[PDB]
Amino acid sequence: SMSNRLIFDADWLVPEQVQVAGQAIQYYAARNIQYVQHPVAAIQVLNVFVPAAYLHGSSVNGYQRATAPILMPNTVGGYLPGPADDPQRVTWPTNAGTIQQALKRGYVVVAAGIRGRTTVDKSGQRVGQAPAFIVDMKAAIRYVKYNQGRLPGDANRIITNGTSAGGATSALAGASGNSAYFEPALTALGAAPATDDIFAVSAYCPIHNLEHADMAYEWQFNGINDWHRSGQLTVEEQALSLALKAQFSTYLNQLKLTASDGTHLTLNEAGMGSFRDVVRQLLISSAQTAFDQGTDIHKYAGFVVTGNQVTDLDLSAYLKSLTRMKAVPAFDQLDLTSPENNLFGDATAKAKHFTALAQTRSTVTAQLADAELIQAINPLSYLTTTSSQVAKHWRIRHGAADRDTSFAIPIILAIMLENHGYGIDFALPWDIPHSGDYDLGDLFSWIDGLCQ
Template sequence: MLKKIAAAAMAVLMICQLTACGESPDDNTKTEGISQEKTEDTSQEEAEGTQEEADSSGSITTNLEKIDMSKWMYHAEDNVYYQIGISYCEMPADASYETLAVFVPGDYLSGTDNGDGTYTCEINSEAEVNGYAAEAAPIVIPIETPGYAAQAALTDYTSLTEYMEAGFVYVHAGCRGRDAGAPAGVTDIKAAIRYLRYINDAVPGDAEKIFVFGMSGGGAQSALVGATGDSELYDPYLEQIGAVQGVSDAVYGSMDWCPITNLDSADAAYEWMMGVTRTGLSDDEQAISDAMAASFADYINQAGIKDENGNVLTLEESADGIFQAGSYYDYIVGVIETSLNNFLSDTEFPYDSSASGENEGGPGGRGGFGGRGNDGDFPGPDGNMEFGEFGVPGGKEGGKELREMDGEGGLEGPAGNGGPDGAGESPYEELDDITRTETSNGITISGTYETASDYIDALNANGTWVTYDAATNTAAITSVSDFVKAFKSVSKNLGAFDQLDAGQGENILFGYGDGNGAHFDGVLAEILKELESSYASDFAEDLQKTDAVGYTAAQRLSMYTPLYYLLESEDGYGASIPAKHWRIRTGIAQSDTSLTTEVNLALALQNYDGVESVDFATVWGQQHVKAERTGNSTANFITWVNECMK
């Protein structure tokens, strides 16, 4: 009901404000119900004497200059041409973030030395790198925004050898973070994409073959960019910063590691799947947790989520636990068992768990504990929130600033301190050093296991929840709750994403640009009202607020929820152009979000007409990292892009 009310208000709000976006990355994927013609009002521009830059059809409008082909820098050792500090919007909200950098394999350009360290270049149409001609190369854009933090604009050259050798054009776009409030981060990336299409005739790379990729909050925003292509809801925000008008911001592919997303149902999902591991709750708190778990069943039963065969999945009441039965429950059991059986298939025994490589490829890893919680917010042994190096409190009281994780400490590469592949000292790995309090049933995987049976015995150390058939090398689990108790204990306070005191990172995300947190979960708000909680008034007050363009938290939440655009039951269905290709990876042992987050996203995409491929896997034993069953995340991403380009 809350979504219907919000949608109705949004429709009224935008009758006069919004215009439809332009062309799609591929004409045959245009979605019905979206106006493809851009209505332009140029009277103000004409009155002010502004310059209009248009393509041959006259639809592109901007005052931005195209990239200056006489300003290329050249890194001889890497054979890379690059430019840094290119403005991608006319009226940046924060010019220190809203610029982009372009890195091009040297063979794609023919350069003439200007004698001052710069080169005048033109596209070399005869060259090929890894089978790609200059004009046909894929463009990849990292979105490394852990905890929805800002992505710092590059100010110097960074080595991107693997991408350059692959023949990719690499574009790093700085973007605002959660302090600016949703939808600032995605808006900025969309503006950068629009600029790339505007300059596509001048630089190497195919702007119709753009891939975005990220992890955690970056994975979430990568999924959002992938799901919200040409959504009219973003128009007032794009106009506010002076983004190029009349071009598409849809992308061709989206790579998402551990995406913290679908925040409209994430609190309820967290309690449904993992609430059973909470301890020490008061009676009032337990009532909230139980009500949230039950509300997730309501969500699933109206969402119309389908399996790969088109069967609608539902939850049913159960004798044990809260709605731990039904076809949706059985599907989640199957996902867990598939993850474990993939591990058994991938792993060669004897198996050294300490050498498995939690963060970059390799099966296994730590078993349920020792991983970190939210990007920046860490629960201590007593269950209360502690704030480590990458985060400080930012609740409703005091207006404390949240530190931008990628803006301080000196990045060496676009993906963090470890460079573009996320290896080494990335923010994710540093946060993974934070330890957890183990539940009474929790298990820890460590040491060397001689056989698969030995490993299964370790999983069952505190009670049997896994059965194993050595003849077929396959395993099964007893229940979701038994899996969670052993392997996926809670690490976040009640109200995992919309915390009761508005102190969570996502609360800052749905704040209003002042560093203060705001509530956004309408379902939790209704529960608190029904339970006559003292927090109910705070939620009700925040849900009535509007931002600078007149949007409520509920409206912005829809914009920041991929499933709003992907499920037929949602009002946003058919109102965007989703990416054709998706790759989703998650560490199944992470406690940062419920496993249902990634499962629901993958299923919605698999059933969406126009999406051509969805490569989804959960990685056993790995946590909140760039999880891969085998190999290196960068190499696997490059391989996937190449497959999508065929």
């Protein structure tokens, strides 16, 4: 209710410990904070965890109470609800280990609970479909920034983190700071009267750009007719696949992505061209890094090794050995059965299409989601320029063995960021599946580079 003043009190913080690599890591916790005045779901609470030194006037890893980065991780996957995380949490989903390491690293951690597509209110009505996930993430950010003076950590150094749909959540928070589109929702929730632009984004395999993901998926996997997650593509699916693949070239070329030498990255009618060479070069770089460490890259097909150098890659052979995960279309299923279809439902419709092709070829009675809504939850929508409500610093990872979305999807994001002058640290880590938080040493060195 409006009795909730959204004022954080450090007196709420209570002392705890957790063991991190043979050491006891001391921190303070304040849990189950209602971060808006009018929540619609029990999941909308956040937890605050603070390195113990900050309540005792001391430092950790170059940081103090006033200056520490604020890591804001989420537990969203599959566009499902993401409960407020906890270094003591053992129940799925959780990145408790990451929180434990962040606290050792000196970061304040604000872990917010986020509605998702299966969330219902007290009346049993759906209240967690799009754009609930990003509204909640923004509301939690506003809570933190409103409480800059009272909450340990520097609200000007918020770094979101998430994997999969959670990675899209992180990327979207970074892309869409203070966008007016979300103001009516945030007002209805009674979110704190503060900004929601953030400092930096960490994203693992962000499942985003949903309205173009089917095109990218078939561009990558057409010609591979069996999928495993098992099935075999139907003749109708094969027809949709070849078309979706072709459409990807038109979409890609119109983005006007540019390489370092200023050349337009493109694809021809057959889906071949300079853009495909970039994808290939990233995978060759991934392989070289692994080879240099004594990894047997020949686990997968296609790599040409000359002496000690990965000199080329037969991309089709690599993809055949990797295997296709999803059927066709991969995201906007004709029968409305995907997590993304359900994400785009609302209190009236359990699921919707979000592409012209699937709507036109729908095998069930169906409506299309609103175009502005689709656009609003796509991080790319905000990046057509070098804006100042966009976070300046990005670190994106997508595993070279991750087949949940095409490699082109995170690559497009990374290049668009670069093209518009943002800081972007990007890679496709070798033999990594759909997952996140597996390279914390490096993520934390990146954060420290930005913040110390």
